[PDB]
Amino acid sequence: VEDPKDFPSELLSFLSHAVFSNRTLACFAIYTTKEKAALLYKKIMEKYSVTFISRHNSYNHNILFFLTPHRHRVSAINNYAQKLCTFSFLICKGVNKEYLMYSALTRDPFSVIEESLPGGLKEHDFN
Amino acid sequence: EDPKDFPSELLSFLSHAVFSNRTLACFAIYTTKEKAALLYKKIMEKYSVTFISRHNSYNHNILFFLTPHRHRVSAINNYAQKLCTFSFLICKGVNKEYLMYSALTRDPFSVIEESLPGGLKEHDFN
DNA sequence: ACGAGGCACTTCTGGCCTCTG
DNA sequence: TCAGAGGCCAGAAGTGCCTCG
């Protein structure tokens, strides 16, 4: 109901917009509640052995941004993360523009709650 | 959430197989009032049941039904699971179809709704 | 009878890759 | 190159058939 139906309109140009692709990527984003972002961060971190993960503030909910050293399907990440929940909203999408998406998440009206490397894609190549 | 199996007085009728790939045409489901009303409609559309009834059982509801083709209990269960809601659901094969239905029609049990006017009689079962 | 379980699909899952603009 | 659509693939999971005891 009041739950978002997509990511914030300001992030949309950075996200993947495939509906029918079997393409795999290495940068994903997840939009969920405050409660689930905490749990998801660690779980996701361990499962996918993330080269990077950050947790962000978004309009009274949270966004998880993360890079993975291996390629995954958006639906594979989605399925893994839905099997934690039930039960609360979750939008999961591939990210096409990693620097841009990261840096947008560090500025208003978004902010960093916590991240696994300080400064992230601004301070580190993940090449 | 609540109950952990079917009422003990109906257990003799059910199949308890856990390692069988055998398929059946009679099943019963234990669940809440809200879930049983819905699974009545949806199991019938889904399996195009030859008969389906919904009954009062101790705070909750049982659904009994016969399907025109053969299914694995695990199928009926994977389907019925997908319409919960971490509300509870016991789903089992029925070995003794008539005896199960007839028990569910008498005290402590009663019929709420069934897909045939005046339910089932003994002939009907083979 | 009925539970165990061999078997045979078929559907699902989650990667690969090329094509195309 | 990029990114979405989709061919293809292999291994897992699903949901039937059967016969054996």
Numbering used by the authors:
A (entry chain A): 132 to 258
B (entry chain B): 133 to 258
Reproduce the article's own wording on this structure.
SV40 T-ag is a 708–amino acid protein containing at least three independent functional domains: an N-terminal J domain (amino acids 1–130), a central origin binding domain (obd) (amino acids 131–260), and a C-terminal helicase domain (amino acids 266–625). In the case of SV40, a single virally encoded initiator, large T-antigen (T-ag), can bind the SV40 origin, assemble as a set of two hexameric rings, and cause local distortions (ie, melting) of the DNA. In this paper we describe two crystal structures of the SV40 large T-ag obd: one in complex with duplex DNA and one as a dimer in the absence of DNA.
The crystal structure of the SV40 T-ag obd (amino acids 131–260) with duplex DNA containing two high-affinity binding sites, P1 and P3, was refined to 2.4-Å resolution. The asymmetric unit contains two T-ag obd subunits and a DNA duplex 21 nucleotides long. The two T-ag obds are oriented head-to-head on approximately the same face of the DNA and make almost identical DNA interactions with their respective GAGGC sequences. The DNA positions the obds such that the residues within the B3 loop (amino acids 213–220) are facing each other in an antiparallel fashion, with Phe218 from one monomer and Thr217 from the other are close to one another but not quite contacting. Residues adjacent or within the B2 loop (amino acids 202–204) interact primarily with the DNA phosphate backbone, with only Arg204 making sequence-specific interactions. The site-specific binding of the T-ag obd to DNA buries approximately 1,600 Å2 per GAGGC pentamer. The interaction of the two obds on P1 and P3 induces a 17-degree bend in the DNA.
